[PDB]
Amino acid sequence: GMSNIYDSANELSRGLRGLPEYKAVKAAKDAIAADAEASKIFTDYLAFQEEIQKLAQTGQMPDASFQAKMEGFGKQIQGNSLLSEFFTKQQQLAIYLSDIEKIVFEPVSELLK
Amino acid sequence: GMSNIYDSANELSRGLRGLPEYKAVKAAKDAIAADAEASKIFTDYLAFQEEIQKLAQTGQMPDASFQAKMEGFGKQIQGNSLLSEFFTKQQQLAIYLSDIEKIVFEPVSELLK
Amino acid sequence: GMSNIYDSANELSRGLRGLPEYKAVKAAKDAIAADAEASKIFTDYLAFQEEIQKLAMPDASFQAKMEGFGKQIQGNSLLSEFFTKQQQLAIYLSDIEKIVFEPVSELL
Amino acid sequence: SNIYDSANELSRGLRGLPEYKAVKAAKDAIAADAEASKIFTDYLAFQEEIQKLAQTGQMPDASFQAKMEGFGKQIQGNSLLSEFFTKQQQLAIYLSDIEKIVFEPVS
């Protein structure tokens, strides 16, 4: 009953970790970590995440510094094979997980109505 | 392959629907839709929640007005037994839902944190 | 042009710090800092702020916890003095912000 | 030297900044061009999106990074947008300082 929920959650989990797209993102993270150059840009993009929370108090007008700074980081990612691999594999996975979400939480949607 | 992932996602939703906890929130939510006044407080509460979580991106505490508002909603909830039955029962369902979140969906998102 | 902006800015800054409403709030926050009991409730309440992020259906757990801190606040005089005063100040500040940034508003 | 007087004096100084004047000029020009205006409107909708994405703790994904990259190209390829985004950086320093100096010591 409760066991059903956790049995199915576990096998759904295992199944997703078996996807070539999961394998690829994880291997890609490991390759960023082994690479000085990739790793440094990743760590800085990570640190840039809080500048995005700044934005959303200080953001009625378009923030030109932010634009340039985010765009800069973008171009660094595109020019680094390890980083663009990570983000494109991550994106493919999040696409697939989003359709699984829809199935899994349909009984909850039924409760918002 | 992606077939068996879908089978597992479909099986997990069934389990959710099999939870007595799920069953109890569904009965509570319907009893609220039958009542025109519990619906209005419920509707009003939901808009108040989304007001609260707009403070999520300012990192500011809820002030005396939000506190005053929540006191009000809390009196309305406790003195309306359709509302109080739903709130008590949603808490019990909530644990399962956040467990599913945790086991299945959060890991892909964490790739970005 | 620039010096002007910076002088007016200084003047307004010192003016706001000299408002009785600003002082009332600073004195009330200091009183919390000096009361071991209020200090802890306040700290706890600060820590509940990461839970309104997690607020990413009505969350019953959240309403109860939030309702709970509200009552802890109304039950503590130092806390209920801080929040009341802080609100009075917030209305001034917001008035002033409207004036100062009206030229930016026109840009939107 | 009361607060309303200082706050009014301060906003009039803003109006007087060449940096302000240069941003108003570039916003109005943009207002009068359908091309530039829709990108502006879209960019702003996208800022909102970044802002809401923000609070999740995540990095912007490949898709957000690509949206940003698209807008970058559009701003750099459109003259009225280039003028605005450049003049906005310069004004931003003054707006920030006012925030820093006036408001955060009482908030």
Curated annotation (Swiss-Prot), chain D:
InterPro entries: Com_YlbF, YheA/YmcA-like_dom_sf
Alphabetized SUPFAM superfamilies for the sequence: YheA/YmcA-like
Family annotation (Gene3D superfamilies): YheA/YmcA-like
Pfam name, any one: Com_YlbF
Family indicated by similarity: Belongs to the UPF0342 family.
HAMAP family named in the record: UPF0342
The protein's name: UPF0342 protein SP_1372
